[PDB]
Design a binder for this molecule. Structure first.
Ligand SMILES: [Cl-]
Ligand SMILES: [Mg+2]
Ligand SMILES: [Mg+2]
Ligand SMILES: [Mg+2]
Ligand SMILES: [Mg+2]
Lengths: 222, 244, 241, 196, 195, 243, 204, 231, 250
């Protein structure tokens, strides 16, 4: 993974690549690394894929119950606190590295969380194997006072640096924009710069190629 | 301390009866009548709903007949909520058996465990017993078609035909009268309704105040099918035997 | 009738121990009153020190639950303090777990849920208290939420509690019928306190010295109680009026 | 980390660099290591970021609850709560924390809590990897009852040197001033402090 | 322990189990029966870690005998083998797992078919025409792949078994002191006394 | 009715009769007082001499908690000891976590909450004592009185037991006649006097006096017993004023 | 001592036009020694198909567990579990053993009975859901399967064509793996008929 | 009346009836006396038998080398409390190398007895004890009652007609208090004291039980022929 | 200390009644009227906000509660008991369903879980039954719209339409005359508002009436866009204004 987060004028944007690996093998070319915690709090995740998914869902569930209980829109610092205390309790063994962002009645927020439970605050952040490629771009092009359109561009550029230069990252760019006073917009496959070229040949087989020993109709009914 | 407020739900009367069980049975005797009849080629379960309103959702409702597994169902007489606690337990117990042995649970073994649970509430823990009586309709490859009843005491017994709930004395005399061993399912279906028709505390027996189920060998060869009748199907079988 | 000693239903579907817990609410013969300003929430309660041997400063039914939340109690002090210690703990834990200050209305709901449990579980008796929570909530603005032994709670425009509560209530209803608004349209909390004391005086038909009252004020980011001197300064302003 | 806290005439000042590191990679170059556990009781954090945050969060919670029940806690009390956590969990923690606060009775106070969870009350304290390089400098230049400006200079010069030699330390120099007047945050950027 | 074999023929399951019990450099016993009758038409042979083997076998036996008395009914070989598998599958994630491998030979009276199940200590169950645990398999599986037919008589199965034991006596490094052979068929369980 | 048979039950008037019955056991006990002074507090108690066989000075009733808090009580004596044992655990736990010795108001609520907790359930009995206690902390001197209901307040002076009304009246005097404060050595004398004046309400048996005090100046803020010369000097001051 | 490669085996799933296919080998070995040629790795609960590779004891255990859970699901919900839902149940169940996992690589295949969509998904041993439009692979020859599938596959294959493609992907992957093969089984799955074919393959 | 069902119930006058009924079992108990000088402390206990074929129940139990008690009331309850004391004396030695002060023994018994007077399900102890010991501040006599009240005395008695001995000791005070450095004289003053509580029957050899502890005497018990010397 | 009440406080009387359940239902009888009506394309649930003082802000007290995005609840009886049941009901939808299957429970099953919670307060040691009857309205993909009543005993029944509390006997009769199997949602809202006027004595407007629907999916109420399969909650509380609009054309 490469994941990033970038603040702007009136909100915050997060982005991520879409590659999943098992060693050198690409298991999933288009997996979703942007997780909804609540409608306007989204999490970009790196690390152990199951752990980022599970921890993001658990806290998301508890946040919904909390939101219902308090009759209030949930805040990012609550998701931040619940996530960090969970991860800390597990002493790093839950391999979830998260960039938490969102808007709430308090404003717009951007944090990161390390698997051991430490948290950051910043205007721009990146995590995962491709985070150095990403951070190189962010450190080169980031400025105070970004428009929404500038932050999106900066974020997806940072993810592209990871896609092209980190072997741990690839495929596509997902983005999510959380702007104050508006609905969160989830831009799944915002960029698809790695479309497979046409194959040279079709490998559709002449029917009957495969030697068969037996057949039978399987009963799926009652 | 708290001793003052304890009813002692698990003690003997001076006659050696269990107060709470007796009173649970008294509760059950006001419940909608349920009948099970066992034939050589299947089992019938028929039960009367507690006095319907015209506005109750008849089709998506289930107050009397529940599925335990694919080969076993029960008819309920008593507190519905108490019954559901026990039903989920029985459903789980069936699955544990299947998981352990890779074989569907024999009907009796499932019946015994549910009865054993009920029994526990009469001997320890200071809780009220479950105000429920079951009729178990089931099939297994050892005894074939079987009927059982269990009550709050946790005592169970097997039957060719039996009733629980209201007017069981009336119903039991009528079944005893017309039941015979070589009887087929479709005769048993007819007997069950005709018995409810005569014992009901209502003006006349209608489709909307009934639940009905059969366990036949009525699918494809040496295999068993459960049929929980839809409202429309009860309407038809009530006409087909000329009760309406 | 043992249905009158523990919290189980009587034949008419009533919980007598809950009802008797309400009657203990007035054991102390204090009346309390809460109103909302534009920027603030004020709560005043009568302070009655009968014994000459008491250290008057230690006699209070107003508690600082958190930096932002204040609570006045109508009921005997042991139950009051029991409730205050619990609410302090719950408010601190909430801040630790969820990363922001516990809102007045959520604490109210929490304490109400705790009270509800005592109405349903036999081994626990209800607390013989009524809890009025006040703050200036960061989302909702000035807030008053009140809890009773039934486990009931609701938010108020203004409220009163005690033996002479009905007098104070109608007094306040009549003001808001007239004013046409949800609150005291006043700039400073100083004048909202003055309003509160003035309408308690009218309703109760009594005069107060500086040692007959107890005042708690909630502003954005702190709740605090007034001193005898702060109150005396306030009584003087009312007099020259 | 390079961190320090120094008592002076009017109270106490906490200082820290802003570098968080995973190996030689700087995960955060603008970290805030000066953490509030109460209005005028702050701490400097060094060691495991996760450990020291989790500890500070717990301490803040404890002192918030303390306040509700018994009023403003003393700086000694705050240091004791830290110690209790650090001492009793010594096997699982990597936390070097400096506690610093301002009473009106006691004025400025500094307590340092090293790895084992012992407590040491001192006129000033230095800690973190970068501190090794300024034991010499700080011992020679510290005086008791310095003014606010002298103290700010002492910390700025000291941490400048810690940052110069310790690769783990770097970024901005953050400071927090704790007096009767209130709470003041200072920041000093590389171009100012590097060429002292 | 070491050698346990099983062959399922037309109307019976045959189990052969080595007689040696070896500790260190001493053969302590040369007549050990590595088997327990679980029910009148179900036999379990076993091999593995010392102590664990018998403790497991007898525990299973007790459970199955309990079931029989409770239901006045004999559990089918398939049902027993599943119970056994689950017990081992639990065991493998315990604090100290049962290091025991088993073959279960039974005659299903309802199907009138013999059945052989091979289960290892991990709880890996498989039904087979013939099975073995340990190093025995490395010689006998290929031998049986060749000489085995599904419709063999109990007599033919015994000769096939003689082939296996002769091969093991030739190529195995250790003296396992022959085998006790047992036949499970429609009439229950009997031991062949001269092998 | 039957509302008074079980602790924690509200009567229809909103009362806990068992707590009120516990109070009767308190009122039945020997007299004990506490006087708050300029920079400290004084405690004294009446020890009824049941028999000549009681060893004098050797059945001590005032109890120290931590190093700075004194506790005296009237009612069921073992109940008071149980309460002080708890107070000692509470003070140790406070000191352990926060280093500073427990402040008196803090300590008062610890006992308050604990005593109050014994009015919450029917499986425990309320405390059969009223407890007068206090000492010196970083904010000065504090005197408290705590009752079976869990109710407590801060006091200028306090009294409980059979001679409570005699002692109360005598306490109100000193409050009126010393509005600017009472010195510790004076309070020790007055303490002795009031116990003698309160002994009339219990004059079958004659008694042994017992006094203690915490004073910032006189005892360094620590709880000490008054014995020897200062005790006899105050016994004599009291003997003066009953004539 | 690597639990996922003691027994051996493979599973592959593929979507086509209004159909899905799921296939597996039949080998169960103990390392070098092949033990059974009849060990099927594909199970079904109603119309949802589950293939499981990895440690055989866990394969059996999980089948028994998912039969258990889908049976109770059916009794309470009064309807058969769908592939999307079963996938979630598989994930929850695996993650529940996060720090003592089942050593498996499950694969789900089926057609949603309401929407008619073909659905496949795969999981790691710890519950991560890998959803795919095209194909899922699992087992000791997963690299080989990935290479076979990635070149052989094309979208919208007809049931009889998809059969050839998936069969050829499995057969050639299995033959480059010591621990996979010894027979194969292929399920072709359409809206409401399912054909099961046993493939002829080399037995070494 | 209505308020005597359990220990957890006060009466409207503020009494604890189960505790008072426990006290009553003491009064039905056979008499025992304790008294001390500045150098020694003595227990005398009149033992009771069931009938002429029976043994005379043991009334004195040793707790440590420097401490022990006599009992009056429920004997198994004395066995429990004495066992608890044995453990507390033991704990003091093993942990602090310190002999348990008789005064502390008193406090620990008070606190153990009290817990059973405030909790549901429990019952008060139904036994009274007289505890003697020689510690670092000299000789001591303690009277335990199951209300939890423990009292230090020069002398006392408990049980059936204990009032005779208790008057005698109240008279004899200034005499026996100064029987310093004479064991057999202090014992005699105890046997004399206990005789004020006898009626129709008097002290014999398998009837009387004496125990003594002091400056250079380990707590020791005398029965049978070893007490003939005192009748 | 602690709970020494490990025995049932609900036991069978000699006539076979369960006293506390009967008495719980009596408290439900005293409760303010609430109702629900099932249309072909929606469900409505409604009740009266009987304010306790005019100084109380009755908006801050919600008698109608969202349980899941497609399930709502209303009650008659004791408010506090309802409040905690809603808390437990929301949580149990997550713990025993959503965290397992990754989707919200169908109405009947969530109802089944609430029933279970209520049944246990009828048998467990040291508790009394819940003094409320719930009406739960919801939607799910495979069963469509449904309405359920849950009683203190833990029993539940599906309804076309019904009422509970004070004026339920009268209101149920009103609903029998008006209900047909062809009602559109707006038709049922109108009938609900008519039925409710009978049992309300005082003011009758959008400030004293609480009413919610389970109808169409509300994308405007979702809070985010970009996942086309997430379409928004079907549960919607009608505003004070929305109700008053309907009360004019009444
Ligand atoms: Cl809650
Ligand atoms: Mg209660
Ligand atoms: Mg660690
Ligand atoms: Mg540097
Ligand atoms: Mg191969």
């Amino acid at each position: 993974t490469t994941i990033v987060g970038v603040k702007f004028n009136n909100g915050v944007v997060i982005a991520a690549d879409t590659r999943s690996t098992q060693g050198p093998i690409v298991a999933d070319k288009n997996c979703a690394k942007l997780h909804r915690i609540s409608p306007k709090i989204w999490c970009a995740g790196a690390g152990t894929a199951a752990d980022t998914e599970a921890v993001t869902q658990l806290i998301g569930s508890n946040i919904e119950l909390h939101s219902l209980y308090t009759s209030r829109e949930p805040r990012v610092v609550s998701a931040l606190q619940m996530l960090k205390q969970h991860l800390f309790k597990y002493q790093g063994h839950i391999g979830a590295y998260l960039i938490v962002a969102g808007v709430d009645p308090t404003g717009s927020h951007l944090f990161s969380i390390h698997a051991n439970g430490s948290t950051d605050v910043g205007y721009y952040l990146s995590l995962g194997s491709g985070s150095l490629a990403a951070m190189a771009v962010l450190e080169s092009h980031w400025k105070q006072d970004l428009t929404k359109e500038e932050a999106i561009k900066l974020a997806s550029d940072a993810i592209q640096a990871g896609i092209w230069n980190d072997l741990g990252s690839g495929s596509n760019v997902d983005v999510c924009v959380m702007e104050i006073g508006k609905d969160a917009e989830y831009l799944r496959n915002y960029l698809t710069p790695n479309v497979r070229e046409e194959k040279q040949k079709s490998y559709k087989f002449p029917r009957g190629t495969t030697a068969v020993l037996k057949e039978s109709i399987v009963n799926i009914c009652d | 301390g708290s001793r003052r407020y304890d009813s002692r739900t698990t003690i003997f009367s001076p006659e050696g009866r269990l107060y709470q069980v007796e009173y649970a049975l008294e509760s059950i005797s006001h419940a909608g009548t349920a009948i099970g009849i066992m034939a050589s080629d299947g089992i019938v379960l028929a039960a009367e709903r507690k006095v319907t309103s015209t506005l109750l959702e008849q089709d998506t409702s289930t107050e009397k007949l529940y599925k335990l597994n694919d080969k076993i169902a029960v008819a309920v007489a008593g507190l519905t909520a108490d019954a559901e606690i026990l039903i989920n337990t029985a459903r789980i117990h069936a699955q544990n058996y299947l998981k352990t042995y890779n074989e569907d649970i024999p009907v009796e073994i499932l019946v015994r465990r549910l009865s054993d649970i009920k029994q526990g509430y009469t001997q320890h823990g200071g809780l009220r017993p479950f105000g429920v009586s079951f009729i178990y309709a089931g099939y297994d490859d050892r005894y074939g078609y079987q009927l059982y009843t269990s009550n709050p005491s946790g005592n169970y017994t097997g039957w060719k035909a039996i009733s629980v709930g209201a007017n069981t004395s009336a119903a039991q005399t009528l079944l005893q009268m017309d039941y015979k061993d070589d009887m087929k399912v479709d005769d048993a279906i007819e007997l069950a309704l005709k018995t409810l028709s005569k014992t009901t505390d209502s003006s006349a027996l209608t489709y909307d105040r009934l639940e009905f189920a059969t366990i036949r060998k009525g699918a494809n060869d040496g295999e068993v099918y459960q049929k929980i009748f839809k409202p429309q199907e009860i309407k038809d079988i009530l006409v087909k035997t000329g009760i309406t | 009738g043992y249905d009158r000693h523990i919290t189980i239903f009587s034949p008419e579907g009533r919980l007598y121990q809950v009802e008797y817990a309400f009657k203990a609410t007035n054991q102390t013969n204090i009346n309390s009153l809460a109103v909302r300003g534009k920027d603030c929430t004020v709560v005043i309660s009568q302070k009655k020190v009968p014994d000459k041997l008491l250290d008057p400063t230690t006699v209070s039914y107003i508690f600082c639950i958190s930096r932002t939340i204040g609570m006045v109690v109508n009921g005997p002090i042991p139950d009051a303090r029991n409730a205050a210690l619990r609410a302090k703990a719950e408010a601190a834990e909430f801040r630790y777990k969820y990363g922001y200050d516990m809102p007045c209305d959520v604490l109210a709901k929490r304490m109400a849920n705790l009270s509800q449990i005592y109405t349903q579980r036999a081994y626990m008796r209800p607390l013989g208290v009524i809890l009025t929570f006040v703050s200036v909530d960061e989302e909702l603005g000035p807030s008053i939420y009140k809890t009773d032994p039934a486990g009931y709670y609701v938010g108020y425009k203004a409220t009163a509690t005690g033996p002479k509560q009905q007098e104070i209530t109608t007094n306040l209803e009549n003001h808001f019928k007239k004013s046409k608004i949800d609150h005291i349209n006043e700039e400073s909390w100083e004048k909202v306190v003055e309003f509160a004391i003035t309408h308690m005086i009218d309703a109760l038909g009594t005069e107060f010295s500086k040692n007959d009252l107890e005042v708690g004020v909630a502003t954005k980011d702190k709740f605090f109680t007034l001193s005898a001197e702060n109150i005396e300064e306030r009584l003087v302003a009312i007099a020259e009026q | 980390t390079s961190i320090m806290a120094v008592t002076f005439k009017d109270g106490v000042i906490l200082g820290a660099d802003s570098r968080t590191t995973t190996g030689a990679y700087i995960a955060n170059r603008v970290t805030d290591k000066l953490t509030r556990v109460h209005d005028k009781i702050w701490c400097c954090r060094s060691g495991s970021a996760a450990d020291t945050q989790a500890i500070a969060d717990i301490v803040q919670y404890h002192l918030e609850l303390y306040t509700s029940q018994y009023g403003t806690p003393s700086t000694e009390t705050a240091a004791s709560v830290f110690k209790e956590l650090c001492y009793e969990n010594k096997d699982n923690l990597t936390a070097g924390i400096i506690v610093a606060g301002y009473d009106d009775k006691n004025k400025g106070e500094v307590y340092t809590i090293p790895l084992g969870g012992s407590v040491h009350k001192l006129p000033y304290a230095i800690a973190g990897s970068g501190s090794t390089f300024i034991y010499g400098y700080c011992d020679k230049n510290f005086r008791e009852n310095m003014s606010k400006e002298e103290t700010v200079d002492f910390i700025k010069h000291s941490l400048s040197q810690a940052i110069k030699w310790d690769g783990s330390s770097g970024g901005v120099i953050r400071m927090v001033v704790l007096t009767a007047a209130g709470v003041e945050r200072l920041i000093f950027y590389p171009d100012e402090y590097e060429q002292l | 322990m070491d050698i346990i074999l099983g062959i399922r023929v037309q109307d019976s399951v045959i189990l052969a189990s080595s007689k040696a019990v070896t500790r260190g450099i001493s053969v302590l016993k040369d007549s050990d029966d590595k088997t327990r009758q679980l029910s009148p038409h179900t036999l379990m042979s076993f091999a593995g870690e010392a102590g664990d083997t018998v403790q497991f076998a007898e525990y299973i036996q007790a459970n199955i005998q309990l079931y029989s008395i409770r239901e006045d009914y004999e559990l089918s070989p398939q049902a027993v083998s599943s119970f056994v598998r689950q017990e081992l599958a639990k065991s493998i994630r315990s604090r100290r797992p049962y290091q025991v491998n088993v073959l279960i030979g039974g005659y299903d009276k309802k199907k009138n078919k013999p059945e052989l199940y091979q289960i290892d200590y991990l709880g890996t169950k498989v039904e087979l025409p013939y099975g073995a645990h340990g190093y025995s398999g490395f010689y006998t599986f290929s031998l049986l792949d060749h000489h085995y037919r599904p419709d063999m008589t109990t007599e033919e199965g015994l000769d096939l078994l003689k082939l296996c034991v002769q091969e093991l006596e030739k190529r195995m490094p250790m003296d396992f002191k022959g085998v006790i052979v047992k036949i499970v068929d429609k009439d229950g369980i009997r031991q062949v006394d001269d092998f | 009715t039957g509302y008074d048979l079980s602790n924690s039950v509200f009567s229809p008037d909103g009362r806990n009769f068992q707590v009120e019955y516990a109070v009767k056991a308190v009122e039945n006990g020997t007299t004990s007082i506490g006087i708050k002074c300029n920079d400290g507090v004084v405690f004294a108690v009446e020890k009824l001499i049941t028999s000549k066989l009681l060893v004098p000075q050797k059945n001590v009733k005032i109890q120290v908690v931590d190093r700075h808090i004194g506790c005296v009580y009237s009612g069921l004596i073992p109940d008071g000891r149980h309460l002080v044992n708890r107070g000692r655990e509470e003070a140790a736990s406070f000191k352990k976590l926060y280093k500073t010795p427990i402040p008196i108001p803090a300590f008062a609520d610890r006992l308050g909450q604990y005593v109050q907790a014994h009015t919450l359930y029917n499986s425990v009995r309320p405390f059969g004592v009223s407890t007068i206690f206090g000492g010196v902390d970083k904010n000065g001197a504090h005197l408290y009185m705590l009752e079976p209901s869990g109710s407590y307040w801060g006091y200028k002076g306090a009294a409980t037991g059979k001679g409570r009304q005699s002692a109360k009246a005598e306490l109100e005097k000193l409050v009126d006649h010393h509005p600017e404060g009472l010195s510790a050595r004076e309070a020790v004398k007055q303490a002795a006097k009031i116990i003698y004046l309160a002994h009339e309400d219990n004059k079958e048996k004659d008694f042994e006096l017992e006094i203690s005090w915490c004073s910032l100046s006189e005892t360094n803020g620590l709880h000490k017993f008054v014995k020897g010369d200062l005790l006899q000097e105050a016994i004599d001051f009291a003997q003066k004023e009953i004539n | 001592s690597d639990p996922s490669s003691i027994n051996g085996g493979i599973v592959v799933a593929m979507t086509g036009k209004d159909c899905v296919a799921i296939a597996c080998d039949l080998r169960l070995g103990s390392q070098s020694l092949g033990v059974s040629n009849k060990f099927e790795k594909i199970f079904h609960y109603g119309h949802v198909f589950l293939g499981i590779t990895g440690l055989a004891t866990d394969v059996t255990t999980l089948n028994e567990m998912f039969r258990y859970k889908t049976n109770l699901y059916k009794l309470k919900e009064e309807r058969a579990i769908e592939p999307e839902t079963f996938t979630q149940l598989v994930s929850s169940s695996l993650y529940e053993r996060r720090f003592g996992p089942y050593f498996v690589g499950p694969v789900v295949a089926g057609i949603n009975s309401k929407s008619g969509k073909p659905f496949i998904a795969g999981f790691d041993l710890i519950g991560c859901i890998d959803e795919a439009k095209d194909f899922i692979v699992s087992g000791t020859a997963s690299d080989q399967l990935f290479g076979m599938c990635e070149s052989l596959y094309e979208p919208n294959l007809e049931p009889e064509d998809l059969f050839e493609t998936i069969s050829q992907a499995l057969l050639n992957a299995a033959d480059r793996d010591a621990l996979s093969g010894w027979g194969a089984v292929v399920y072709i799955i359409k809206k409401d008929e399912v054909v099961k074919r046993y493939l002829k393959m080399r037995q070494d | 009346n209505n308020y005597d069902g359990d220990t957890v119930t006060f009466s409207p006058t503020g009494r604890l009836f189960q505790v008072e009924y426990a006290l009553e079992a003491i009064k039905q108990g056979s008499v025992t006396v304790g008294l001390r000088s500045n150098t020694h402390a003595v227990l005398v206990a009149l033992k009771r038998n069931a009938d002429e074929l029976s043994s005379y129940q043991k009334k004195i139990i040793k707790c440590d080398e420097h401490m022990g008690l006599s009992l009056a009331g429920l004997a198994p309850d004395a066995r429990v409390l004495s066992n608890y004391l044995r453990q507390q004396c033991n704990y003091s030695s093993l942990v602090f190398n310190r002999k348990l002060a008789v005064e502390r023994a008193g406090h620990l018994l008070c606190d153990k007895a009290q817990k059973n007077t405030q909790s549901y399900g429990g019952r008060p102890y139904g036994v009274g004890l007289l505890i003697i010991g020689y510690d670092k501040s000299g000789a001591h006599l303690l009277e335990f009652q199951p209300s939890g009240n423990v009292t230090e005395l020069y002398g006392t008695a408990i049980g059936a007609r204990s009032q005779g001995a208790k008057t005698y000791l109240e008279r004899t005070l200034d005499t026996f208090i100064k029987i310093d450095g004479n064991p057999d004289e202090l014992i005699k003053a105890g046997v004399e004291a206990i005789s004020q509580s006898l009626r129709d029957e008097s002290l014999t050899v398998d009837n009387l039980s004496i125990a003594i502890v002091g400056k250079d005497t380990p707590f020791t018990i005398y029965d049978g022929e070893a007490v003939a010397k005192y009748i | 200390m602690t709970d020494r009440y490990s025995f049932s406080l609900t036991t069978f009387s000699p006539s076979g009644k369960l006293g506390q359940i009967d008495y719980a239902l009596t408290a439900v009888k005293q409760g303010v009227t609430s109702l629900g009506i099932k249309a072909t394309n929606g469900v409505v649930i409604a009740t009266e906000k009987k304010s306790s003082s005019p100084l109380a802000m009755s908006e801050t007290l919600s008698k109608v509660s969202l349980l899941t995005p497609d399930i709502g609840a209303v009650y008659s009886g004791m408010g506090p008991d309802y409040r905690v049941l809603v808390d437990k009901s929301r949580k149990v939808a997550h713990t025993s369903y959503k965290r397992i299957y990754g989707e919200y429970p169908p109405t009947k099953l969530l109802v089944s879980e609430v029933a279970k919670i209520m049944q246990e307060a009828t048998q467990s040691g040291g508790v009394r039954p819940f003094g409320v009857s719930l009406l739960i309205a919801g939607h799910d993909e495979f069963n469509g719209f449904s309405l359920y009543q849950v009683d203190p005993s833990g029993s539940y029944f599906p309804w076309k339409a019904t009422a509970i509390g004070k004026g339920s006997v009268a209101a149920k009769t009103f609903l029998e005359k008006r209900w047909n199997d062809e009602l559109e949602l707006e038709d049922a809202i109108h009938i609900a508002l008519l039925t409710l006027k009978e049992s309300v004595e005082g003011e009758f407007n959008g400030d004293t009436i609480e009413l919610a629907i389970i109808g169409d999916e509300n994308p405007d109420l979702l809070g985010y866009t970009g996942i086309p399969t997430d379409k928004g909650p079907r549960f919607r509380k009608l505003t004070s204004q929305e109700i008053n609009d309907r009360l004019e054309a009444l």
